[PDB]
Amino acid sequence: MMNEKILIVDDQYGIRILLNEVFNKEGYQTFQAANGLQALDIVTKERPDLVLLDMKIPGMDGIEILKRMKVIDENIRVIIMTAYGELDMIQESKELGALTHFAKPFDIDEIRDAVKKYLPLKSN
């Protein structure tokens, strides 16, 4: 009765903040990441069920990160905040473990909406 953990992987400033306050009042313990190693660490320390992976991180493709998440837990969810760009491992990444695929500019309403349908909160 306390698996409301989340990992917001975003290096660009603006998403880790907006997505934060949003999941902060709605009732969600989201974290911050971007280097990739920080996301996997918080994932092995708390083991959240929602992970926001962004392909914008200008340092290393997050394609490997998703792999580690599939090697540590198969019931892990991850969304792609970059649908407006390319689509190589995104298609297969879907059936793999990519719940939805958000892009930019996105709407904080569509992000919290998909997060609510996926992870159900306590009764009301």
From Swiss-Prot:
Cofactors named for this entry: Mg(2+)
Which GO terms of the molecular function aspect are on file?
kinase activity; metal ion binding
Q: How is it modified after translation?
A: Phosphorylated by KinA and KinB. Dephosphorylated by RapA and RapB.
Q: Which CDD domains match?
A: REC_Spo0F-like
UniProt cofactor note: Binds 1 Mg(2+) ion per subunit.
Question: What does the UniProt entry say about where the protein is found?
Answer: Cytoplasm
Question: Do you know which Gene3D superfamilies this protein is assigned to?
Answer: 3.40.50.2300
Positions where 4-aspartylphosphate occurs in the chain = D54
Q: What is its main location?
A: cytoplasm
Xref: InterPro entries: Bact_response_regulator (IPR050595), CheY-like_superfamily (IPR011006), Sig_transdc_resp-reg_receiver (IPR001789)
Q: Which SUPFAM superfamilies match?
A: CheY-like
What is the purpose of this protein?
Key element in the phosphorelay regulating sporulation initiation. Phosphorylation of spo0B during sporulation initiation.
Name of this protein: Sporulation initiation phosphotransferase F
The gene that this protein is the product of is spo0F
